[PDB]
Amino acid sequence: KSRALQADIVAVQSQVVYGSVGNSIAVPAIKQNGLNVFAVPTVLLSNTPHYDTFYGGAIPDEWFSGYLRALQERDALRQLRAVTTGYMGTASQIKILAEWLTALRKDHPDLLIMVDPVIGDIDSGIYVKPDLPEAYRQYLLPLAQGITPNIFELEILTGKNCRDLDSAIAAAKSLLSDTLKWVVVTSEMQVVVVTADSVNVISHSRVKTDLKGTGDLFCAQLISGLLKGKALTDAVHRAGLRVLEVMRYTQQHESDELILPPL
Amino acid sequence: NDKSRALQADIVAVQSQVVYGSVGNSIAVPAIKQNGLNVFAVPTVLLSNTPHYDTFYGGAIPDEWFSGYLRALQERDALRQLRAVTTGYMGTASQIKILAEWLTALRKDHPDLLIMVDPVIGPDLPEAYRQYLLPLAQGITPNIFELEILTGKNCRDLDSAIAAAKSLLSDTLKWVVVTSASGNQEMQVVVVTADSVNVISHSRVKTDLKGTGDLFCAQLISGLLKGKALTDAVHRAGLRVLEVMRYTQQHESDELILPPL
Ligand SMILES: Cc1ncc(CO)c(C=O)c1O
Ligand SMILES: Cc1ncc(CO)c(C=O)c1O
């Protein structure tokens, strides 16, 4: 009874008509690892707000709710192996998103969910809808099987520890459970992998640049190796090396926007 | 002029975009991309899938968004390499006015800009094109139903339809590619440039697969920015559409599926 398109992933996040970020850099990343995917956009702008202008807004909680729901009526989740979340637009979309996911596993009990808590940074955090960090903790976390937060996106989520690598691992540890299997804490110059029992600390050297999307690149390359048979740490180390690569090529290319080189 | 450290592209395709599916940019951008051509696609509507299904969600982009989007590309300075711009299924009519305006602007720094326009019609849509868009296109691809309403003329033969195309050429509008499916169905196409008339035909399969045109166009343009002579290009892109459909036929897909280049 299957003749409708099918896909591995159902990545839900930001989409730009200009710039490398959100599904506008992740989908191409995915496709390269030989994988099908569906991009359900949360917001739909012109460019990145951090630019100088930027137009467009967020997809309404009635359209965006239809999209996901559509992928189920169309029956294209026959080969679904994962769902990933990125830049959100409203804590209501996040609630919506959850309800959808929650119904999912009852058919895809082996579903992989991967959330990226897009909320803060060093300059200043919560540079997003203030309501998002609550929606994250109350709704979209009790499902994640492995999240990729950073030192500050982790402080907000746990209401816990700070700048001590240990304090961090602790806080991460306090997050694991039956559903959450792992956690990739960042601050990418130092990346700690905290498994349900074990700890790995990968570390490379990052260059200076205001390019946005690496997070989306990284995460993308991460679900790729994981949905391809790579071990956790092994997988991470690759999605991370890849992003350092990607960044060189655009610096070499002299372009304030990411550029997906070959495979 | 100093180098532009921003993203660039040859086309600025403008039409629909479906989360699930193969219509509009959702199939254009890929088709384009295959011929090794960069492109900025500007949405017009954002629907779950195409309306011709049991169910579909979404609507049409806010004028303001739809505008800022356009204005954007420029404030970002990512058009130095542009050469074309192609319309597609439009949500409103105001959009066209705006899309026009913008074009009007662009057309001042890019005198060699080829504007292709598909009269995706089948309420107010007629006029907006007549008044705002039509007067700008350097080429268009309406079918019989589309050429009839866009000229207000009727035409059930070569001469008739032809004269119509002729009755739309000018100092800006250069050619007029018309198409029809006679029925199963045939491809029946006619290339009505001002100084000549070509008519290419093909035998096509029987399907409910949409997007063939968006693709065809998507391809047509590509082959055109590659210095391929019109008529020649028109054929190829026609051929392309069939090839891809066969490919999809085999895989038995209810949506289109791009093979290799
Ligand atoms: C459009 C868009 N996409 C993705 C991100 C996060 O990388 C941001 C962060 O501000 C954004 O604005
Ligand atoms: C949304 C949408 N976009 C484009 C087309 C024509 O390719 C159709 C044809 O029905 C459509 O419904």
DSSP secondary structure letter of residue A124: -
CA distance A159 to A144: 18
The C-alpha torsion from B47 through B48 and B52 to B55, rounded to 10°, is -120
For ligand 2, what atom is nearest to the CA of residue B211?
A: 7
Residue A18 Cα distances to A14, A127, B79, B204, B258, angstroms = 12, 21, 11, 37, 24
CA distance B198 to B176: 11
Residues 6+ apart with CB under 8 A from B196: none
Structural determination approach: X-ray
3-state secondary structure of A72: helix
Tell me the residue ranges of DSSP E strands in chain A.
15-16, 43-45, 56-58, 82-85, 112-115, 146-147, 182-186, 191-195, 198-202
3-state secondary structure of A90: coil
CA distance B134 to A2: 43
Helices (H) then strands (E): counts for chain A: 8, 9
CA distance A156 to A112: 23
3-state secondary structure of A83: strand
Reported as half-sphere exposure (CB side, CA atoms, 13 A), residue A120 has a value of: 20
Taking the Cβ of residue B69 and every Cβ of chain A, the question of whether any pair is shorter than 8 Å is answered with yes
Q: What 3 state SS string does chain B have?
A: CCCCCCCCCCECCECCECCCCCCEHHHHHHHHHHCCCCECCECCEEECCCCCCCCCCEEECCHHHHHHHHHHHHHHCCCCCCCEEECCCCCCCHHHHHHHHHHHHHCCCCCCCEEEECCCCCCCHHHHHHHHHCCCCCEECCEHHHHHHHHCCCCCCHHHHHHHHHCCCCCCCCEEEEECCCCCEECCEEEEECCEEECCCCEECCCCCCCHHHHHHHHHHHHHHCCCCHHHHHHHHHHHHHHHHHHHHHCCCCCCCCCCC
Beta bridge partner(s), residue B45: B60
Name the maximum alpha-carbon separation found in chain B.
56
CA distance A70 to A94: 17
Q: Give the residues surrounding ligand 1 with Cβ less than 6 Å away.
A: A 14, 16, 21-22, 45, 48-49, 87, 118, 212-213, 215-216
Gap from A66 CA to chain B (nearest CA, Å):
5
Q: Is B156 exposed, middle or buried (0-12, 13-18, 19+ CB in 10 A)?
A: exposed
Residue A6: CB atoms within 10 Å: 15
CA-closest candidate to residue A143, choices A104, A172, A171, A173: A104
Chain B residues inside the 8 Å CB shell of A44: 43, 46, 65
CA-closest candidate to residue A191, choices A231, A234, A161: A234
CA distance A110 to A107: 9
Chain B residues inside the 8 Å CB shell of A18: 7, 40, 72-73, 76, 78
* Cα torsion B61, B64, B69, B71: sign: positive
User: At which residue do the structure tokens 């003749």 appear?
Assistant: A3
Beta bridge partner(s), residue B24: B17
CA distance B241 to B204: 9
3-state secondary structure of A155: helix
Residue A38 near residue A10 (C-beta atoms within 8 A): yes
For ligand 2, what atom is nearest to the CA of residue B210?
A: 7
Residues 6+ apart with CB under 8 A from B80: B1, B4, B8
Q: Which domain holds residue B261?
A: 1-261
CA distance B165 to B151: 9
- In single-letter form, the type of residue at position B178 comes to V
For B59, name the nearest residue in chain A, comparing CA atoms only: A63
Beta bridge partner(s), residue B204: B185
Taking the Cβ of residue B24 and every Cβ of chain A, the question of whether any pair is shorter than 8 Å is answered with no
Give the CATH number of the domain where residue A201 resides: 3.40.1190.20
Residue B255 near residue B209 (C-beta atoms within 8 A): yes
Q: Is B38 exposed, middle or buried (0-12, 13-18, 19+ CB in 10 A)?
A: middle
Cα(A96) to centroid(ligand 2), Å = 27
Total domains in the fold of chain B:
1
Beta strands across the sheet bearing A43-45: A15-16, A43-45, A56-58
CA distance B205 to B187: 10
The C-alpha torsion from B47 through B27 and B23 to A74, rounded to 10°, is -60
Taking the Cβ of residue B145 and every Cβ of chain A, the question of whether any pair is shorter than 8 Å is answered with no
3-state secondary structure of A145: coil
In degrees, rounded to 5, the angle at the alpha carbon of residue B192 between the alpha carbons of residues B187 and B194 is: 170
Q: Is A31 exposed, middle or buried (0-12, 13-18, 19+ CB in 10 A)?
A: middle
User: At which residue do the structure tokens 């006679």 appear?
Assistant: B182
Rg for chain A (alpha carbons), in Å?
17
User: At which residue do the structure tokens 């899938």 appear?
Assistant: B49
CB contact under 8 A, B21 and A5: yes
| Tokens found for residue B205 | 């399969």
- In single-letter form, the type of residue at position B245 comes to M
- In single-letter form, the type of residue at position B77 comes to D
CB contact under 8 A, B78 and A254: no
